[PDB]
Amino acid sequence: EPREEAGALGPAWDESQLRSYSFPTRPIPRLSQSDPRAEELIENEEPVVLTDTNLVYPALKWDLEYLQENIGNGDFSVYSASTHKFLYYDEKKMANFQNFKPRSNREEMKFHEFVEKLQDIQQRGGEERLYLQQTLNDTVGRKIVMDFLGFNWNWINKQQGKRGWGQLTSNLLLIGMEGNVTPAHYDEQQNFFAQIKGYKRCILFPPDQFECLYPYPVHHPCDRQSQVDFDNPDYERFPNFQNVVGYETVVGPGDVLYIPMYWWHHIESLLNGGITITVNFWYKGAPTPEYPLKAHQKVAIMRNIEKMLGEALGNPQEVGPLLNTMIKGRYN
Amino acid sequence: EPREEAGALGPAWDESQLRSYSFPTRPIPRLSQSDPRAEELIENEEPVVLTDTNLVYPALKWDLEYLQENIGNGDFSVYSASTHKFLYYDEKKMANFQNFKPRSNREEMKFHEFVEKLQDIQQRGGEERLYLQQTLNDTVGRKIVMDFLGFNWNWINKQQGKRGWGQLTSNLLLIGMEGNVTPAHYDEQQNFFAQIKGYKRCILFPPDQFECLYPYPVHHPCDRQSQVDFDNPDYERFPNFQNVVGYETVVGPGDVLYIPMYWWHHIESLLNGGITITVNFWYKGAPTPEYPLKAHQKVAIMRNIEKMLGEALGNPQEVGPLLNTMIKGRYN
């Protein structure tokens, strides 16, 4: 049930702003950072929404005007699509799958250019969609530098230390239009996902749902993304998608969602909710040290087999046929 | 067409002594050891029957009486079965497949005991079958030692040298009853198979027929053997067995068949042909050094993946399910 905004400002959102899917879900717990149960969840690599970390407190005032005015003149990656779906793809892997045609295109532009583009679409009633996704770096301006330094490093550094994580590799700034969707995928880093402006519905699946989510081949550009079109699921190709069960929540300004490494996540900016802003915090996982093996360890194993085969056969397109030859009439 | 025995002693065998199978075959070339084409075949790891190596010339006089009298008092492995099929199995792998029930049993006995056993079966018209398969070692007697030293080491040592093979690991003595069959399998060593007494029909398949022959899982006791029952092929489980094509020949006293490493072979002692005697020569293959990869190199790869998975998962029975999880809806 949608939370009530302080000062009797009404429900933050309603059901009609959520897209409709074929699978059930249960809620991700929303807890205080001081609550021992929250610590227990993170320790165990289970998702939790923390409501009071103040992780990005200084960024809560961010909006397009403030950012355009202060974020500097560095380049920003902006994806353009004609669909609500922004399927991530790795450009370096495109040569090995000549037949892959991306539904979204990347363009590098200045921030003010991104804003202007957003403005032209609105005014002309265009259907085009943009999604800015850019790692925060040294070209940001002084005020942004001041804001960034004001993030709650004390709290997050302790988390990093307590969990034995590796280094912070980056902070991705995400600015999306209402209705934008990042289709289901998993990342190989730990993530504290800090919501800043607007609302995002986040649907997560544990690593043990690998069999229901059908990730692309490792060498395909959409490595780590699910092949299933959540809007039109092909049960003939992906029969176990009928058994998938998610954990969901809607995060708003001030909320931080722990997205544990290897956990699948599908993220959508609420329909008619305006633009969204998020900053994530990606950390390398702890080192690999006991049976039974965890789901995520089996995932790691499968990825490695795929990678080794690709290298040994000298052509990633030969991976499938060898794998098939290995199992038919033998293990299946 | 069956060869004619010298001195007008008639055909060495006839068609009716061969079992009937579902697949076609072509003949393996029979050539002189001095013929350059023979050398070309061996060099290329293709089978050839050599008719005049004199490799085991001194063993041509061997028969049960001579061997009982001279082969010493060491133990001999003798397999007993109630079927003509002597499917090889690795006893060390039996613990991991508790449900595997061998159709043949191994018994260690003295040579004279093997002979006596053969005698009792004949006299009592029993249906039991025996197959002696024993590595030649230090307990053999002086006359056998004299015979063994009289093998054509000059010729075979040159082969070993020319092909870059590793060491001779052993010589297996095989003494079988008429009608005995060693079901299709491949070995990871190079083999010169030297026929001594009686006739054996040998059906070989190249390594690129892996997909048609369905070897057991690597951790199963029947690793390297085909799961297909050549006498009653299950096309539902093994559909590509319908595409198998063999190379065949019948070897007799004096013949040597080069069975190249990784080549499948099915070997049968001719029906109503009396006992057979063979001595093989197993050599480790050359060292692994270029694309495209050979069929046998892909086989090596598949074996290694199976082995690594077994070790990493800590339980070989988990190999199949992981492999299936890897490919369904992803590579198949």
Binding site: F148, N171, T182, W282, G285 | -
Partner: peptide
């Protein structure tokens, strides 16, 4: 075999490096 890389939906100063420099 159990070892893992660090790939995410983004290309490879930033992160820890950005913070310290600042």
């Amino acid at each position: 075999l159990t070892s893992y890389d660090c790939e995410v939906n983004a290309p490879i100063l930033q992160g820890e490096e950005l913070l310290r420099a600042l």
